[PDB]
Structures are given as C-alpha cells and as structure tokens.
Amino acid sequence: TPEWRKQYIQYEAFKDMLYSAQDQAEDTVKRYFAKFEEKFFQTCEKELAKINTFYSEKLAEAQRRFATLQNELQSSLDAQKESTGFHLSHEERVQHRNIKDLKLAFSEFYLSLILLQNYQNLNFTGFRKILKKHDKILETSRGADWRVAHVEVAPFYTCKKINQLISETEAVVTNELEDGDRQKAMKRLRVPPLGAAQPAPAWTTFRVGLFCGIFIVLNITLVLAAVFKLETDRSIWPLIRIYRGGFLLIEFLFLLGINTYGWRQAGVNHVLIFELNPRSNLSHQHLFEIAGFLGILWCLSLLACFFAPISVIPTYVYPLALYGFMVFFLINPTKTFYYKSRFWLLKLLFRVFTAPFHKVGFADFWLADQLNSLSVILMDLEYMICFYSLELKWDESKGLLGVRAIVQCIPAWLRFIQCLRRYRDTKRAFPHLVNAGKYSTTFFMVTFAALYSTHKERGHSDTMVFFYLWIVFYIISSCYTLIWDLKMDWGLFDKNAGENTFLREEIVYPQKAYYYCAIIEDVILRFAWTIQISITSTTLLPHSGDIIATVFAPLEVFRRFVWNFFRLENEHLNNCGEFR
Amino acid sequence: TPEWRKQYIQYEAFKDMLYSAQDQAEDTVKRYFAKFEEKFFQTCEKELAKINTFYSEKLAEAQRRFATLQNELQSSLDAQKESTGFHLSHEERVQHRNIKDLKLAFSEFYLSLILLQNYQNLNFTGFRKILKKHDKILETSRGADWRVAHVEVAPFYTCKKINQLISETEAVVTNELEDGDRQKAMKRLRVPPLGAAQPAPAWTTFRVGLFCGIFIVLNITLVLAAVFKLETDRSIWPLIRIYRGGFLLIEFLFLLGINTYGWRQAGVNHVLIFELNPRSNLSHQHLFEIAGFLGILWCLSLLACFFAPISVIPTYVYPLALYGFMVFFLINPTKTFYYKSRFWLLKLLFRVFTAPFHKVGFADFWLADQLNSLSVILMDLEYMICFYSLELKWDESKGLLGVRAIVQCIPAWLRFIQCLRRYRDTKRAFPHLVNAGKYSTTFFMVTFAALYSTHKERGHSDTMVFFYLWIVFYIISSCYTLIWDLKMDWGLFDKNAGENTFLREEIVYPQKAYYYCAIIEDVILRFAWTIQISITSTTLLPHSGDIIATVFAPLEVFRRFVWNFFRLENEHLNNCGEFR
C-alpha cells in the first residue's frame, strides 16, 4: 500500500528467520530455541506497541478532524439557513461552493477512516495468522491462549469506536447533506473497491448470468413440454411430489441469495452476527450461482424424466441421480468447489442436528429455524426412501410414475431441544421458555391431528370432539407463533413507536410500505403454513392434499425469505437475541 | 482524488461564473463580455501554464527516479550474478530481500506513472470539453482552431514520453524480474481499476453470461429439433441460405469480440489506431453481449420457422421480422441502447460505402477489408430481396421453404476505389498501387468465371480455353493475395528475422506456435476463400453449391478473425500502414 506504513506487519521476515533457525535445529539447544521464541514474542510485543500507538494517535486525529468538520458543517448550515435570507446575489453560489468543499472534505475523511479500519483489520488478520503459524511450529505453551489474551483485546483493536464513528458519520451526513437517502451518498461515496476484495468478481458474475439464463430457458421449455406432452399416464403425483423437494430447495437458495444481497446493500451487518470470517464473504453472487447450477441440474433431471430417457435406462434413475449428485456435492470432502463453505455448512449441520450436546451460537439457531420451515424437504426425502425401498419396480422399467408425523416434527424437535439447551445455559424465563412453548404447540397440533384422522378412518363416533380440540389447538398455535414473530422476534408493535406509526422505534430499510406489506402477508400466511403442515401430514384428504401442499410450500419458503429480512435487521438494530 | 492537486481543472467555477455573466447579459456590453471572454482565455493560459509546469517537473522527477531504480536494479543483478558465487549462508535470503524491495519500488513507480498519465489524460479531456462548452456559448472566433493550436500541442501533452516510458518499464521489468512473461507482472501489477473506468461492469458481464447461456441452450435445442423433426419438405436450401447471412454476422461479431479481448490483454494498443475516443472503450464484454443478443434473436427466429408458427401467421415473416429487427436496432436514431456506438458505426458506413468522396483514415479501410470477406452477407441480402419480391407467395402461407457477380464485387469495388483515393491523396507507388491490383484480380476472376459458366450453359465448344484462363487467373489472384497478406500486410517473412526464425524481427504475442498455425491455416484457406467466391457466384454447380458455400463461409470469417489479430498487431509494432 502507498500509505504511511513503516512495516505494519514485518511482512515475512519473522517466518524467514524462524525457518532459518528451526531448519538448522537437547542439552542447551532446548533453551536456545526457547530463547529464540522468547525474542520472537518480545518482537510480538514490539509489534503490539507499534500498532497500539499508531492506531491510538491516528484515531485521536480522526476524532479531532471529526469535531472540526462538525463545526464547519454547523457553520455552513447556519449560513445557509435563515442567515442569507442562478445568481440570487451570488450568495447561493457561495453556499454551493461551501457544499462542494464540505462534500469533498467528508469524502476524504470517509476514505481515511476506511483506510484506518482496513489497517487495523489487516493487522488483526496478519499477526493472528503469524501467531497461528508459530503455534503450528510446535504447540508453544505461550501463543494460543496467551496470544488470545494479548491479541483479542489489543488496545488498538479494543476500541470499537471505529464502527460507531463510521455509522454516525453516514447517519449525520445523510441527515442534511443527502436528505436521509442512501442513493446520493452512494453516488458520491461509491464503495471504493478497497476493503471488500473485488466484490462480485467478473467470472462469478458471468457464471451467475450463464446459469440464470440456462435456468430461464429450461423453465420455459419445461412449461411448454408439460403443457403439450403430459397426457400419457394419469398419475403424475409421484413425480411432482418427488421433485417438490428439489424445487423448494432451489427456491430457498435463490431467496437466501436475495437475502444476502438485501443485508449487504441495506446497511445491516450480517457477517458479525453470523460469526463468519471477516474476509470469507459469501456475496449474493456465489449463492445465486450455486442455486442456479442446482436448478440447471433439477431442470435437466425433469426433462430427462419427461421426454425420453437415453432410450433404455431406468427412468427412476433421474430423481435418484439428481439427489445423489446434490448430496455428493454437499458432502464431497476434497479440496474442490467451495470446500470452505461446504465444510462450514457440514460443521453447522453436525452442531445443530445433534442437539443439545454443543452450544447454541446464532448460526445453529438460524439454521434450525430455517429447517422449521423447510420440513417439507425432510418429508419428501422420507417419501423418496419409502417409495424406492418398498413401492419401486427394480426390474420393471416402464415408468417411475405412521412416522410421517415424526419426520415432520423432527425440525420442531431439534428446535425445542435447542431452546431447552439455551435455557439450561442461561437459566432464564421468557423469552427463553416461550420459544419452547411455541415450538411444542407444533408437536401438540400435529399429534392431535394425526389422532383425529386415524380415529376418523377407524370410524369412531367421537371425532367431533377431537376435531374441535384440533381447531382450538391450531388457533392457539397460530396466534402464539404470530404474536412471537411480531413482538419478540421482529421488534415491531413496541411501546416506543414514536414517529414510526405501528412500527419499531428505529428502522433500517427505506420504505415503511415494505414493513406494512410484510406484516400483512405474514399474518395471512402463518395460517397457511399451519394448514399446510396439518393437511400434508395427516388430514388424509386424498386427490387434493398433494396439490394444496405443493402450492403452499413455495409460498411458505417465501414467508421465511421475508422473515430472514426482518429478523436479521432486528438482530443488528435492536439486537436483543440473547446472543453476545 | 486524494492526490497532490491544487485544482488541476478549476472544477466548474469557470462555467458557474460564465453562466452568472451570460444569463445577466450592444453599445459597450458587446466589448464588456468580449473582455470577459478575454479574461476567461487568459485564465485558460494560466491553466495551460500550470499543467505544463506540473507535468514538466513531475515527469522530470519520474525520469530521475527511473534512472535511480535502473542503477539499483543493476546493482541487485550484479550482486546476484557471479558476485555471491533456504539458508545458503543467508546470501540468497539477502538477495530475496533485495528482490522484494525492488519489486515494491517498481510497483509504486508504476502506480505513480499511471497516476500522472491519468492526470494529463483527465486534464486533456476536461479543458477540451470546457473549451467546447465556451464554443457552444457563441461560436467564439478564438477557441476552436485557436484552442486546437494551444491544446493539441500542449507542452504538457506534447511529450509523448509517457507511453515510451511505461512500455520500456514493462519490457525491462519483464526482462529479468519476471522472465519476459506477462503472468508474473500481471500477478504483482494487477491492473488497478483506476485508468480504465470499471472494465467489464458487473451488469454487462451478467448480461453476457445470460445471453451466452440462452444461446448455448437454444443451439442445443436447435440441433435436436433439426435432427429429429426436419423430414417434411425436401427443400430446406431456401431457409438455410436465407439464415446463413444472420449466422455469418453472429459468428463475425463473436470473433470480433474475441479480437478486442486479444488486443486489450495482449499489450497491443487498438484505440489509438482506431481513433476512438480514449474514454469510449468498447471492451470485449459489450461486443460479446450484443452478439449474444442478436444470436438469441436469430435462434428464436429459426425455432419459430421450424416448429410452429403462432398457428396462423405467414411463416415467411420470421426471416423478415428478424432482419427488420436487426436493421431497426442498427438504424434507430433515438437515445437508446448504445446510441454512441451505433451512430459511430453509421457514420463509418457513410464514409466507406460512398467512396472515394471523403478521406480514408484507418477505420474505413478496416471495415472495407472486413466487407471484402463478409460479401456473403450482401449476397444473402440480394437473395432475400429477389425471393421476397419475385418468388414469394403473398397470399399462400403453406411454407416459406446476372447481377450476383456485381453484388459480390461491390466490396472489392469499394476497396479498389478506396485505394485509388489513397493513391490520389499520397501520389505513391507500391504498396499503395499493389493493393489496387490485388483487389482488381477479384473483379477479373469473378467476371471470367461468370463468362465461362454462361458459355458452358450456352454450350460453346471453346469452354476449355476459358476454363484454362480462369484457372490461371485464380492461381495468380490467390498467389498475389497470399504474398500480400504475408509480406506487406503482416510483416512476416522479413529480411531481418534474426532470432525469430521465419518470423518478424519483433513479436507481441507469447507463443510462436500461434504464428505458425496462423500462417499455415491462412495459406491453406486463401484457396478456400477464392474457391468459395467463384463457386457460389457463377460456377453454377447445382445441388452442392449452397452446401459448399455455407460450409466455407463461416471458416472464411474465421480466417478474417485471425487476420485482424495479426494485422492490428503489425499496425502497432511495425506500424507501416501509411496511416499517421
């Protein structure tokens, strides 16, 4: 960097002479290289002091400049408001000159604060990794925990005033200089490529485009082929219900990409709350292209099952082949496409599915909540297993076309156990226990629906009472989950509405109409979710159950797409969440 | 910019008070605002002096730093070569430290020279546009030509040592620091986004991907549909020969995009020789996406002509509809998609087709040469006109499926007239007149072939002599055009081959195998081009003429794709070209 750096890292000399010593390589050599590590760590203290001092006085200069520019901004505002009253006596042009110079000064100040934030971040990363390397050399007694003690606090890193400074600078600038709108500041502060390493790389965007185009055209051909070629067999429900899982996954991945885009460009931090590595960013482009590729695979699988199989290949292979490809991509353990992200996702799966065992964090809870909505995927996988193990024709190849309650409750089971672990760790009341109650309502409703349906099939004369009980339990479950989604999980309908009518005290997204539409759709769609789960689980209604389930599931995934939006914004703004 | 600038432009104050004066607005007011313009232009002289002085001493400092770093590079090379002889007595690590510091110094020097080149370029653009604005105010007697006198030379801009400095810096750095390979310097000098304004913008790359994917899948569906549905009519030649023009245009546009990419990333300047605006760059992404969109249109047109028309729409509309869409896109005069580039292309078409009239430049000659190969497009348009005017069924809608020599010679006619205009302007010999002779060989061969074919149809007994004459004329035409393409139009086979065996003295592209493959394919493909033109023009051979013509035309466009590559590199390296 062409910045005022002396070394700021030591680059790689530490490692160069570490190699020079260790490669050369008991009696007194033990203590000799122990002393060498001791001077290594005294140089580490020297680096700590250097970064501490440099961050300290640069940050102090930043505060001084902030105060000076606040005074200048107040002076400019005073002279333009009630003090002066194309030419307009040239006073308006003088004020325009003041506006331009204020904007330039604020832009260079923004660049400087971004630069110092980058400086401290790159230091953090650098010397953390060098201490990691020293630990790998041989498991030093110091480092590791001692490194944490002297690094995680790191008086240069201790002061979290960088984030508050940048946030308040943006807020106060948009207050009057850019009338509270992101567009103008974005125009004059166009996110310089530094800080975020080439966001949306060229090739990733090209692949996003290619896969999205292939998906669009494949979908068009699929609609056309289904419309003009379906006839033949009169039982397409097995195929539609077997590919509903893939379709729901594709839709959820597209909408999660949209969620990441909205979080990134709406000013709501999401990497910090997700505890991801600051540099390992999964920008929306990566998620969009992964979802597009899986969509290409799904569409090709359905096309193959439709028109013609390679003219002598069991057509039941295509669902199995597609799902095997998906699971192999997710589980493949080598060092190929997106190995880091897949490994992180697998570790999260291990931490969440085997509950309570481990801690809770936030990613585990978020994924458990997402499964609470995607349970239709588990249902479809159970149906796949059952069909391909009992109702299949292993030799015949003329065409593919009481535990369901347990599998449907599995997501609610893991979420309930997660919340019980939360309660054990914290030993607290509501809102810790109310979540457990709400998620147990799902168990109660599903099991009572199953009992009522099996009694109806049996033909008992008391099914009216059980139906009434199911109605009341469904009502209370939907009401409690809606009240939870509005009050304790979104922050809306607070007692401090203030200016924001019927909304939270503070907001991040631009238009309130978005919030109103989201609330109305959520209230009208929680009933839909409950109805869908009950109906597709045990209501037993034939000839229409599959169609209703498959028209409601994608819309439920859309519900979760909105709910991610309006939770993770409440996690960063109000940030109750019990996490950190 | 956070650079050492005082104003470097005057930003917009010149225009601010120009508006303040002119809006306020004979007797003595005439001379009053004449004096105002006089002080405007004295301030322009002040700006000229400022930029001249600043460029002068910054450039002198650049030369001083260049000399100092040359001395340091020589010292490092001396100490690493024959002077010193993981550890290797630590001398190799000292030399590695020298390498790292030399690389860092050269990287910052490269950044500085790029910065000063940007400074002078942005000045040029800025004050050129402000003088343009002053001219628009009211057609000042000064400015315009006086502005050219005091701007185009511009002692800050007069010294073209910037280009030679950057080029020799790259060359000398790759000489030993990066062993003559672009990859290493590219790795450590990754084309900072400054200078080229966000090359390949995100949305343009996304559209490139989308259109390329739609094109790939449409092509797959087209192959499948043609293979499994062609039957029906036994006369597909009208359709194939009517869409051959569109296919050739799509292929040529894709290959021209590849040409622009190769020029851009192979270190061969192409904007300067094309006299395009320095900022209005048509990166390869734009050309690729335009070609992809036209390909989507063509593929959809063929699909519509294939399967089913919207079930009651004359199927002959689809070729007409596609070509009307293309011509409307090219000719539409509003301020919509790529208006600047389309207007430039239309002006070039006017300057080239109406020859000699205007001057020659280089873009006109290049486009005339490209038409000399794409003449099949003119032939296909002539066939379209003839068919749709004489052999069509205006009412019947059951299915669409001696001037040809003149239209085939039209490109050679315009090129010949262009070269005659060149000769008139310059009053010179070979290589100015040899081009005219070579392009007249095409007239001679085509007309003699036509006469021989019409005599053969007539049944004259002297067709043997005419066939022999056509053979000899074809031989001499192919030989002369090949000798021209190798000697005077590529620079290859020079008498100063030196190290480069059988090649030019200096080369730009990395691998010589590329040059050898290109020469061999050109020698074996010029015969193919001549055969194709003669056969598709008048050889009269039925039942095979269309197929041979349509297998050879795309390959001829490929020939021109290679020839652009290896001419515009000879235009920048040897730069004979008679132009500038």
Short mmCIF file of C-alpha atoms in Angstrom, two decimals, chain A residues 230-236 398-399 401:
data_model
loop_
_atom_site.label_atom_id
_atom_site.label_comp_id
_atom_site.label_asym_id
_atom_site.label_seq_id
_atom_site.Cartn_x
_atom_site.Cartn_y
_atom_site.Cartn_z
CA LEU A 230 -48.16 -34.52 -20.27
CA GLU A 231 -51.05 -36.78 -21.40
CA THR A 232 -49.98 -40.47 -21.29
CA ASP A 233 -50.11 -41.52 -17.63
CA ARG A 234 -52.82 -40.16 -15.32
CA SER A 235 -50.65 -40.40 -12.17
CA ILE A 236 -48.07 -37.58 -12.14
CA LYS A 398 -41.92 -48.92 -17.82
CA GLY A 399 -42.10 -45.69 -15.81
CA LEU A 401 -44.89 -42.55 -12.44
#
